Every structure is written in structure tokens, then in C-alpha cells.
Design a protein around this nucleic acid. Structure first.
Ligand SMILES: [Mg+2]
Ligand SMILES: [Mg+2]
Ligand SMILES: [Mg+2]
Ligand SMILES: [Mg+2]
Ligand SMILES: [Mg+2]
Ligand SMILES: [Mg+2]
Ligand SMILES: [Mg+2]
Ligand SMILES: [Mg+2]
Ligand SMILES: [Mg+2]
Ligand SMILES: [Mg+2]
Ligand SMILES: [Mg+2]
Ligand SMILES: [Mg+2]
Ligand SMILES: [Mg+2]
Ligand SMILES: [Mg+2]
Ligand SMILES: [Mg+2]
Ligand SMILES: [Mg+2]
Ligand SMILES: [Mg+2]
Ligand SMILES: [Mg+2]
Ligand SMILES: [Mg+2]
Ligand SMILES: [Mg+2]
Ligand SMILES: [Mg+2]
Ligand SMILES: [Mg+2]
Ligand SMILES: [Mg+2]
Ligand SMILES: [Mg+2]
Ligand SMILES: [Mg+2]
Ligand SMILES: [Mg+2]
Ligand SMILES: [Mg+2]
Ligand SMILES: [Mg+2]
Ligand SMILES: [Mg+2]
Ligand SMILES: [Mg+2]
Ligand SMILES: [Mg+2]
Ligand SMILES: [Mg+2]
Ligand SMILES: [Mg+2]
Ligand SMILES: [Mg+2]
Ligand SMILES: [Mg+2]
Ligand SMILES: [Mg+2]
Ligand SMILES: [Mg+2]
Ligand SMILES: [Mg+2]
Ligand SMILES: [Mg+2]
Ligand SMILES: [Mg+2]
Ligand SMILES: [Mg+2]
Ligand SMILES: [Mg+2]
Ligand SMILES: [Mg+2]
Ligand SMILES: [Mg+2]
Ligand SMILES: [Zn+2]
Lengths: 51, 109, 213, 112, 117, 169
RNA sequence: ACAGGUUUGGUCCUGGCCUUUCUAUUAAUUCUUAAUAAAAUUACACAUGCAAGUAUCCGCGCCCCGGUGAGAAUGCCCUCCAGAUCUUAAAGAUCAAAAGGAGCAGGUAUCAAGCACACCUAUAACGGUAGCUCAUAACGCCUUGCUCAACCACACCCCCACGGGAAACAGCAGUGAUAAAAAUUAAGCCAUGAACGAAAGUUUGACUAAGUUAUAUUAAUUAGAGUUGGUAAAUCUCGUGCCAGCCACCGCGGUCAUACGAUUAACCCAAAUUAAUAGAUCCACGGCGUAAAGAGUGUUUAAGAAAAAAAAUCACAAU
RNA sequence: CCUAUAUUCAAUUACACAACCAUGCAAGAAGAGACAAGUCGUAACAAGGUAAGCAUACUGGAAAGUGUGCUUGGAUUACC
């Protein structure tokens, strides 16, 4: 009874986690857009200087 | 120290008592080799009455004779006890008065 | 027990083997063993002195192999009784000899190991067994004609009550105890003596080692 | 049904110290012992020899030991049951996914 | 300690003080000393009559018969005591000594009436 | 005790008062936790506070910690059957972990009370002997009985010397 | 520890030593009677007596009890039980060898390496890998009974006991020797226990009851010991003159000594009182600029901490 | 070996061995401590009359002296 109960519990928590992680993935892609922008800018500045 | 170090060394343990002149025994029986006189240390002066004795353990030691006056010759057997005489450097033993060949001090007559 | 530095004692084993060997090799013939001085009533071998109550029966009676040595087949199928049984038990007490293995170191051939089937107080055992207290002098042989006179047995039933009262306190305990659980039966609690049957001390014990089941 | 070991150790978990011997893993099991003066818990370590049938054990793996009913030798009282954590390669028992340290190697939220 | 042989036995261990005896009824190995180690204490026996004129015996009957139920032999005074309780039949020697005592009383009665004359 | 961050937890009392008693199935508990992240927090606190309590009442159970192996905190219990309980502890508080574990494999207060009840019937009030095991030694010390003669010297008649000196003459 | 004395011309700090409490032996001085308890120098040598027999012969018993602490870091706690014994058909139950290990377990690291101390294969051998223990103390050396309803170990010596030295009280009494160390060459099996006996019962220096001894309690019949500079309760007059002597620590004695010796008085314990020796107790969860103490420097291993928020990087005389 | 049992044996051989320890005694050697109201100086303490000292080297009846780096647990009294 209790082992099955614990099983159920761990599965519930697993779902909660999966939700949280998808969220984090979204926020992370947003970060990636930001970083992409900055690195593009500085790549341009450097290309200019060297040219 | 830290907790780790205190665990590593264990709790402090009281060192066993180093044993003295009479070797853990309350008294010792011994025979008188010689009787002589010893000057005390510097702050205060007399000449104390001492003897040399050989003890049941075979160790020969200087020993002190309490009370005023005494009769002791070579070969006399005596009983000695632990009390250390403060004036006399190096003399850790004391003749028991009133046993074997050393009698109680005789009241003046 | 086990401490990592433990020493290998060899001489323990040596003393064991050597003592077992000197035991088997020097193992005494029962001829010299049960040999007896009849004047002092003293065994030479063991230095043992015999019980006072056993004195008369030593002088006036003969051991089994003293009466079995002058028998033709060395007494096979014969019937033998014991003086103490004759005196104490009026019902027939006898040994039917199956095998007899005498000891030949004996000059007079008075000693040996015996086997057989027993009838005590008329009751007969169904098996072969080694005979006990052979060296004793109680032993007597019954003649061929009086044989059927001794084996004649009047079968009588046993009158000892099968059940007895419980001791007073134990009884009261049982009563109160079944009273507690709602048992109203006032029927007297009874002690069943059926398996409490014990042989009298005269009954010979078996010398054969027990098989563990 | 009698199969037993007289050893208190029936189930343990320990690190793999060394693989040097044939079909045998040396394993350091570590327990919490209470230092009585300080009333505090420290790690006592003890080594066990475990039977590895397939020689499956790298050095550094976290491993479960089951007590052997009959001792293989004086020093081998245990058998290697499971490899709980393979060294440098670990599949998270919770989410069933490969991970290097606290990072996921394959995301549990990207099934396809 | 390990012995060669011997049996489980219920006996009297003598606890006590000079001229004031007391007995702990005890489940013991046979070969170990009297007052010494024991398997279990069963009961206690106070030989001296108290304020009310009583010798107190306490017996743990459950455990007593557990141990007799395990094949424990009783000592003669243990027997005498259990029989006095009525947990056991009266030991034959209790009764026999009772008779011997009665005959002693009879011969002392007659000797008294013979000396009075 | 002075040294340490939360010195109270090195006290005999604190260790005694933690209540979890594992079933007899439980042999090994493995804690796997992290030293960083907000989520793993409770787990850490657990390792810091209750792990000592737990281990104190379960002296024969092996407890082992592993740090920064898995990205997520959890417990594993190894039973005598070969059964493996996996307990995820994530955003769970310290207390929640304790109560949840006590729930899964605990011992009901019934169980524990029956056990201690069996241990308390071990010492029997009526026995006699050493002060260590017994309430009384002589029966000299029970009220109505005859006193220890080393307290109250006996009447001359109860003395064996008097009885022997009488039988002699 | 409820603390106290003592470093200095003096203060504060640090820091030893000692005092005050309790127990045991011995010794000195004193000692009236009971009861109880306990009885202890010695694993050196032992005169004499006794300590195991029972039982109609077989047998069953005969270091079991009792003795002792020599040895061994021996071991405690805990697994698992062959065997022996008892009872019974079996099953049970008591004692539990060997084998084991979660944990605990004397000192010493100026004992740091041990030197074969592992595993596999399989058939039980051939053979094959090259391991195993250890700074979380291996391997040594020294000291030692114990964690006590008890346990462990020894049984003249050579760990053992075939053999060999050699002729055995470490059973009760005793005796030499030895030591500061001093119980009766005693009475009973009446009671418990043990052995043997079917049983009446017999045996038992186990034990019961006695003998001895201020060793300790208690009760009353019993008064003596120590002390009186400070710590620390309590002193007067003589004698002595750095002499004779005294003291646990400080110290006292050089002609006006409450400190020596004696007297008077007092104090305090009391059938005991002091001394000596061992214990019990007592060090650091405290410290490390100047007092004992941050190891001349950096790196990694083992082992730990990560406990909440971030960082790596630019004039100048590194090498 | 028509019931059944009886009897025998189990000791050597190959080497190494007081090294190695511990415990006494010792011709002798060296040190420390205690020690004159002794002899010779004056090193240190005050810029101790050449500031002390550390490491190291060499030297000297004796404290000690001198070299080379280092320390302040020395001063330079501070609009000089
Ligand atoms: Mg002076
Ligand atoms: Mg003195
Ligand atoms: Mg005298
Ligand atoms: Mg006999
Ligand atoms: Mg007594
Ligand atoms: Mg002080
Ligand atoms: Mg000073
Ligand atoms: Mg001064
Ligand atoms: Mg005396
Ligand atoms: Mg004495
Ligand atoms: Mg003993
Ligand atoms: Mg040794
Ligand atoms: Mg068994
Ligand atoms: Mg065992
Ligand atoms: Mg010893
Ligand atoms: Mg020996
Ligand atoms: Mg001897
Ligand atoms: Mg021997
Ligand atoms: Mg003797
Ligand atoms: Mg003997
Ligand atoms: Mg003598
Ligand atoms: Mg005398
Ligand atoms: Mg008797
Ligand atoms: Mg009797
Ligand atoms: Mg006698
Ligand atoms: Mg006294
Ligand atoms: Mg004086
Ligand atoms: Mg004067
Ligand atoms: Mg004074
Ligand atoms: Mg005076
Ligand atoms: Mg300090
Ligand atoms: Mg310093
Ligand atoms: Mg530095
Ligand atoms: Mg240095
Ligand atoms: Mg100079
Ligand atoms: Mg100047
Ligand atoms: Mg100068
Ligand atoms: Mg100068
Ligand atoms: Mg000059
Ligand atoms: Mg200067
Ligand atoms: Mg220099
Ligand atoms: Mg020069
Ligand atoms: Mg020059
Ligand atoms: Mg200035
Ligand atoms: Zn009493």
C-alpha cells in the first residue's frame, strides 16, 4: 500500500518538475536571443577594427 | 582546536602517577650503612642528622632521622617512610621513629 | 576464538592421536578386568572394593559364563534367570540367549559378552539385545524339563486406576481457569496415568547406543 | 528455506577502491559512527571483498553488495549485486536520464 | 561457562546473613555454584516466621511449569515445597517423616507416663 | 558544547528526541543531494539536522551521503527483500521529508509502545538480588520480616552459637 | 569545586605546585564489651592431617564445586551454531566448542612500513593473474585480568605435554623462605548445593554454625590521639639562641620564638587518632601579536567545506 | 566368516641455531645539575661605556671577538 503510495507521489512530483523545466527552457531561449544580439554587435565592431 | 582534530586525538587522558622513592609501598625496611651530617640549602642553616640505608628493593638511598638526638650504628635495621625533607636537597626518605632499632625519642632526664 | 596472531598448537593433536591409539592397543581384556579377590573382596585391576550388600551373593553364586561354559553349544536357545529376580519377582523373569561371545584370554573361560531376548514379569520383549550385568554373581540356569514350568505364566490384568485427582491447588487453578472462559461443566478434572507407566529398578537397561531420529 | 550468512552486513553500499584481483572488486563501505565525547557523527571506513562475475567494475563506481550465503574465501563474504552509479556515466534514477554532475546530458522534457 | 554435561535444575540458592537465612528459588545449570549464575529466578522462600507467624513462599507457576515442561529436575526441598503448596502431590518423605515424628511423640508420651510412676 | 554552527544538535537530548524508527526491512539509506540551487535546500537541511537524529535511533542502519552526482535531490532505501524505495525530495521542506519518510517505513506508535511494554516486563518487581537488576536484595528489608542482623542483632535463642552451646550441655 | 595558599617593592595577566573532601592498606601511639561484614605480601618451596565417593558386583561420578590472577591487549557487545547433557517417539530445552563481525576496546609513531601477508580457475589437482595489510595506525614494543547476577584464563615448568625436566597445597588448615603486609594444623553434615542410590540414605575443609583480628559499619559499658604563625578551629609561661630542632605549601629558629623543646590553657576528632602510600577527583568545546603555541614558501593527494549574492585580466623593481 | 569377530602398525629424517634481545657488572670516557664569604676577568642589564640579537663561519683562558646578510625585542629627543 505504502510503496504504491510513494510511487504515485514520485510520479506527481515528476510531472511538477517537467512543467517547471519546460518553463526554464523557454526563459533560456529568451536569454539565447539576448546573447546572440550582443555577440553579433561586438563581432561587427571587431570586424570593423581589424578591417 | 576544531571538532575534527578533537575527534582525531580523542579526549585528554590523565597520565598515571610517576612513582617515588618507596616505589608505591607505604614503608620500606632497610639497614643502615653509615650515619653522617648534611647542611641544608642556603636560606636557612643547621646540620641535619642523616643516614645512608640499603632497602629491601636493593636500592641504596639517603634517609633522614627526625627528632632531637638518636642512636644509630651500622647494621641497625630500620623502617623508612615517604616524607620529603624540605631543607635537604635530594633526601626523599624518613626513618620511622619507634620501630626496630630506632626507638622513640627519650624525654629529657 | 580468532585473533590474527594466534599460535598453531601442534602437540594438542599429537597427544590426542597418541592417547586414542594407546587406549585401543592397551584396551584391557575383561578377563583380568572383572577378576576378583574373594578373600579381600577387591578387584586387582580397578583397586575397587565391592559393596557390603553384594558380599554373600559373590561367594555363594556364579556368573553367567560360569554356567554357560559347560553347556554344549555354549548355551544357545537356553533359558537363564537371575537370583535377585527369583527372590523379588514371583512372576517369571528370564533371558533367552541369542548369541554368546566368550573371552578366551580367561584360563577358566568365566567371562564374556552375551546377547538375547528378555521376558520380565512374564512380559516378553520382541527384539534381540545385549545382556546386562553378566559379570555379576546372581546368575542361574533353568533345566530343560523345568523349562516349560518356568515359561508357564498366569496372565493377570492391571488394577491401577487410569485416572487420579489433580493436586488440590493445581485442581483449583484448572477449575477457575475454565470458569473464566465460560465453561460451566462441573465435570471433575482428571489426571491420565496411561503414559506414566515406569519399569521397576530391577528391569535391565539396554547397553546398545541410541540411534538418533 | 535456509540460505543465510552469519555476517551483520547483509546489504551494504560502497565505493570501488580497486579492480586489481581477478573477478573480485575491493570496495570501501563507509558508515556514520557517533563519537561519544563530542556526540557527533564521523565516517568510519571499512573494506569488503565482493565477487564480480563479469568483471563489470571500474574504479570509483558506487556499488551495492549482497552477503554471500557461503563464503568464497576467508576475505570474500560478499557478492556484487548492482552497479548503483557507474563512474563518469550516470543515469538519474528519478528522471531516467543521462547526466554529467548537476547538469542533464539529455533533457527529460524533449522526448521526441 | 562451558561445562562437559549436567542438567537444567530448579533449586534453592542461599541468599542471606549469619543466623538469618533466605532462599531464592532458581532455574540453574546443575554444575555451576549454589548462589552463583542462574538461567532464571523462579521464586523466593523465607525460612524464618515473620511478625504474623508466616514463612513466605512466592512461586512463579507459569515459568515453573514452563521449565518442568522443558525437563528441569527439582531438588528435594523444592519438591517438598511444591507439594506443601499443593502444586505437586505430597512428597513420600514428607509423609514418612510425619509418621516417624508421630511414633516419636507416642514413645515419648509412654516414656513420660512410665517415668511419672 | 561551544564549537559548531548549531551546537544544540550535538546534545544527547536533541538526538534522543528525533523520532523516526525504521522497519526491520530497512538496511541501507542513501541520501543524494546538492550543495547548490534553491530547490535542493530542504534536502541539505535534512542532512544537517535530522540525519543525526535518524541514525541515532537506527544504529544498525547504514546511512550514506552523495553530493552533486544527480541534478536532483532524492533518497533511496534498500530493504532486506531486495526492494528499492526511491523517495524524491525536491522543493520539500526538512519537516515534510521527515514526516513523509516516517509515513512510508516507520513504526506505528502502537508498535513502539508494545515493544517497550515487552521490555518493561523484563524486570520483575518480586525478584531479589543486585541493586542493578532488582528493587531489593535481602528479604531483611521487607517490612514485616526478620531484619538483617547487621542492623538489629538477633535474640540469643535464634543464634546458632546458643543452640550449639545448649545441645553440647 | 562555592573555592583557598604561594611568583612581585607593588599591580594586573598567564601559569604550575599545594591545601580543604572521600576510600583502602600499612605503620606509630591508644584500646572496654558485643553484633555484622570482610579478611589481602608472594603462580617461591612445602613436614603432617583432611578436602570424592556412592552402589548387590556393572556403572555413574571424581579442577563440578573450591583456588588463583600467572599468562594474554588479551577482549566487551553481537551473529551463528557443531557437540555434550536432560527430558521425551519425535520435537523441545540447558551448557554452548569451532567459526565469524555493525560497533566499542591500555600505553607508545623515537614501532612506518609488513614481506607472501591475496585472488581466480575449477576440479579439488594441474594451472593462471600479482596481488594483500597499513598515517581512519598495519607490523612491532611495553604494561595488564575484566566492561562484574557474571566473564576470561591457568592447574609444577618446557604457550601445548606425546616426550623431557622432574616429583608439584594457585583445595582447608598449616610451615619455611620472602614482604611495610601474620585468621583455626578448629566442629558438624542439622540446613541449602552437589555426587551416587529404586529407596530409606551415605559422602562432601562446598557450605552451615563457631574460633581469630579495631579492617569497616552499628550499639552502648568504653578515653585517648592530633593540633593551636597563615591557608585553617584553637596558647600561656619558661628553656634554647641560624644551635637543637620544625614544616603539606608559604616559611620558623641570630636573646622578648603564640612556628623548636616542655608547661598552662584551648581546639578538634574519638575507640580511635595521626603519618606514609595508593586510589577516587582533577587538563583543552581552552588557547596560539608581546606569555606554551600560525609550523620559511607554494601545489596537489587523502580527507573535508561547499551552506544566500557575484568574480578570472592590464603604468612601475618577478623569473 | 554353522551366533561371529580377531589382529597389526603410525616413528623419523634434513638443517639452523645466542645471532638477537633483555637484565646485571665493567677497565674506562663524556655531559648536566648542585655547588665557597674561593680564583680570573667583566659578557649582559643605562646608546652597560664598541646598541643588543638571529643564522653561519673562523678565532680566543673565560665570559666572548670579528666577518656576511637579516631582525628591533635600540635610540636619533621629532615647525631640528
Ligand atoms: Mg633561616
Ligand atoms: Mg614531612
Ligand atoms: Mg613497637
Ligand atoms: Mg565403582
Ligand atoms: Mg554471610
Ligand atoms: Mg592559583
Ligand atoms: Mg614574575
Ligand atoms: Mg615577597
Ligand atoms: Mg596491623
Ligand atoms: Mg592484612
Ligand atoms: Mg574462578
Ligand atoms: Mg605480552
Ligand atoms: Mg546444537
Ligand atoms: Mg559459540
Ligand atoms: Mg599480568
Ligand atoms: Mg601453564
Ligand atoms: Mg606451587
Ligand atoms: Mg602447563
Ligand atoms: Mg593453603
Ligand atoms: Mg590440587
Ligand atoms: Mg613464615
Ligand atoms: Mg603475629
Ligand atoms: Mg548436607
Ligand atoms: Mg542430606
Ligand atoms: Mg569435616
Ligand atoms: Mg577504627
Ligand atoms: Mg611539631
Ligand atoms: Mg623565650
Ligand atoms: Mg602551624
Ligand atoms: Mg611548640
Ligand atoms: Mg591551560
Ligand atoms: Mg612565543
Ligand atoms: Mg609566517
Ligand atoms: Mg625555523
Ligand atoms: Mg658586547
Ligand atoms: Mg654613551
Ligand atoms: Mg659590560
Ligand atoms: Mg655593549
Ligand atoms: Mg670596554
Ligand atoms: Mg643595549
Ligand atoms: Mg652568533
Ligand atoms: Mg678576532
Ligand atoms: Mg681585525
Ligand atoms: Mg619622543
Ligand atoms: Zn540481610
Amino acid at each position: 500500500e505504502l510503496m504504491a503510495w510513494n510511487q504515485a507521489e514520485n510520479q506527481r512530483l515528476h510531472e511538477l518538475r517537467l512543467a517547471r523545466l519546460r518553463q526554464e527552457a523557454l526563459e533560456q531561449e529568451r536569454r539565447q536571443a539576448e546573447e546572440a544580439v550582443l555577440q553579433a554587435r561586438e563581432a561587427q565592431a571587431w570586424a570593423q577594427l581589424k578591417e | 582546536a576544531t571538532l575534527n582534530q578533537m575527534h582525531r586525538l580523542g579526549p585528554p587522558k590523565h597520565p598515571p602517577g610517576k612513582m617515588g622513592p618507596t616505589a608505591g609501598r607505604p614503608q620500606l625496611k632497610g639497614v643502615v650503612l653509615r650515619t653522617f651530617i648534611r647542611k641544608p640549602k642556603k636560606p636557612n642553616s643547621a646540620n641535619r642528622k642523616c643516614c645512608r640505608v640499603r632497602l629491601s628493593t636493593g636500592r641504596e638511598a639517603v634517609c633522614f632521622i627526625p627528632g632531637e638526638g638518636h642512636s644509630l650504628q651500622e647494621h641497625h635495621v630500620v623502617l623508612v617512610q615517604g616524607g620529603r625533607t624540605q631543607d635537604l636537597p635530594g633526601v626523599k626518605l624518613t626513618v620511622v621513629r619507634g620501630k626496630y632499632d630506632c626507638g622513640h625519642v627519650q624525654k629529657k632526664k | 576464538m580468532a585473533r590474527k596472531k594466534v599460535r598453531p598448537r601442534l602437540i594438542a593433536e599429537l597427544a590426542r592421536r597418541v592417547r586414542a591409539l594407546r587406549e585401543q592397543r592397551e584396551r584391557p581384556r575383561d578377563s583380568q578386568r572383572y577378576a576378583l579377590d574373594y578373600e579381600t573382596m577387591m578387584r586387582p585391576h580397578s583397586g575397587n572394593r565391592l559393596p557390603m550388600r553384594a558380599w554373600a551373593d559373590v561367594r555363594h553364586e556364579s556368573r553367567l559364563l560360569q554356567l554357560l561354559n559347560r553347556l554344549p553349544l555354549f548355551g544357545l536357545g537356553r533359558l537363564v534367570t537371575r537370583k535377585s529376580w527369583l527372590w523379588q519377582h514371583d512372576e517369571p523373569c528370564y533371558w533367552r540367549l541369542t548369541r554368546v561371545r566368550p573371552d578366551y584370554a580367561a584360563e577358566n573361560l568365566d567371562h564374556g559378552k552375551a546377547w538375547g531376548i528378555l521376558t520380565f514379569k512374564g512380559k516378553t520383549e520382541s527384539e534381540a539385545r545385549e545382556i546386562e550385568q553378566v559379570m555379576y554373581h546372581d546368575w542361574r540356569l533353568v533345566p530343560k524339563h523345568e523349562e516349560e514350568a518356568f515359561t508357564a505364566f498366569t496372565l493377570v490384568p492391571e488394577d491401577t486406576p487410569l485416572s487420579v485427582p489433580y493436586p488440590p491447588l493445581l485442581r483449583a487453578m484448572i477449575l477457575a481457569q475454565r470458569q473464566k472462559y465460560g465453561d460451566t461443566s462441573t465435570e471433575e478434572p482428571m489426571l491420565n496415568l496411561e503414559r506414566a507407566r515406569i519399569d521397576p529398578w530391577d528391569y535391565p537397561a539396554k547397553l546398545e547406543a541410541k540411534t538418533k531420529t | 528455506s535456509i540460505a543465510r550468512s552469519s555476517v551483520h552486513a547483509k546489504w551494504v553500499v560502497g565505493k570501488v577502491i580497486g579492480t586489481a584481483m581477478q573477478k573480485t572488486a575491493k570496495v570501501r563501505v563507509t558508515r556514520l559512527v557517533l563519537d561519544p565525547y563530542l556526540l557527533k557523527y564521523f565516517n568510519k571506513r571499512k573494506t569488503y571483498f565482493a565477487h564480480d562475475a563479469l568483471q563489470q567494475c571500474t574504479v570509483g563506481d558506487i556499488v551495492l553488495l549482497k552477503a554471500l550465503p557461503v563464503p568464497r574465501t576467508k576475505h570474500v563474504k560478499h557478492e556484487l549485486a548492482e552497479i548503483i552509479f557507474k563512474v563518469g556515466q550516470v543515469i538519474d534514477p528519478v528522471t531516467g536520464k543521462p547526466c554529467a554532475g548537476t547538469t542533464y546530458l539529455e533533457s527529460p522534457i524533449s522526448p521526441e | 561457562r562451558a561445562y562437559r554435561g549436567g542438567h537444567l535444575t530448579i533449586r534453592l540458592a542461599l541468599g542471606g546473613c549469619t543466623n538469618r537465612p533466605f532462599y531464592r528459588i532458581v532455574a540453574a545449570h546443575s554444575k555451576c555454584p549454589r548462589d552463583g549464575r542462574f538461567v532464571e529466578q523462579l521464586g523466593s522462600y523465607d525460612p524464618l516466621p515473620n511478625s504474623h507467624g508466616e514463612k513466605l513462599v512466592a512461586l512463579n507457576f507459569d515459568r515453573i511449569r514452563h521449565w518442568i515442561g522443558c525437563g528441569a529436575h527439582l531438588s528435594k526441598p523444592v519438591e517438598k515445597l511444591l507439594g506443601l503448596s499443593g502444586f505437586y502431590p505430597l512428597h513420600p518423605m514428607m509423609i514418612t517423616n510425619a509418621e516417624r515424628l508421630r511414633r516419636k511423640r507416642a514413645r515419648e508420651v509412654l516414656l513420660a507416663s512410665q517415668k511419672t510412676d | 558544547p561551544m564549537k559548531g554552527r548549531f551546537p544544540i544538535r550535538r546534545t544527547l537530548q536533541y538526538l534522543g528526541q528525533g523520532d523516526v524508527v525504521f522497519k526491520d526491512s530497512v538496511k541501507v539509506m542513501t541520501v543524494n543531494y546538492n550543495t547548490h540551487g534553491e530547490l535542493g535546500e530542504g534536502a541539505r537541511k535534512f542532512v544537517f539536522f535530522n540525519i543525526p537524529q535518524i541514525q541515532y535511533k537506527n544504529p544498525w542502519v547504514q546511512i550514506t551521503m552523495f553530493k552533486n552526482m544527480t541534478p536532483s535531490p532524492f533518497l533511496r532505501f534498500y530493504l532486506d527483500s531486495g526492494e528499492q524505495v526511491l523517495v524524491d525530495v525536491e522543493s520539500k521542506s526538512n519537516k515534510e521529508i521527515v514526516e513523509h519518510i516516517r509515513k512510508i517505513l516507520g513504526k506505528n506508535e502502537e508498535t513502539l509502545e508494545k515493544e517497550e511494554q515487552e521490555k518493561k516486563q523484563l524486570s520483575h518487581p518480586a525478584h531479589f538480588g543486585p541493586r542493578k537488576y532488582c528493587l531489593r536484595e535481602c528479604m531483611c528489608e521487607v517490612e514485616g520480616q526478620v531484619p538483617c542482623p547487621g542492623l538489629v542483632p538477633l535474640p540469643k535463642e535464634m543464634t546458632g552459637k546458643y543452640k550449639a552451646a545448649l545441645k553440647a550441655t
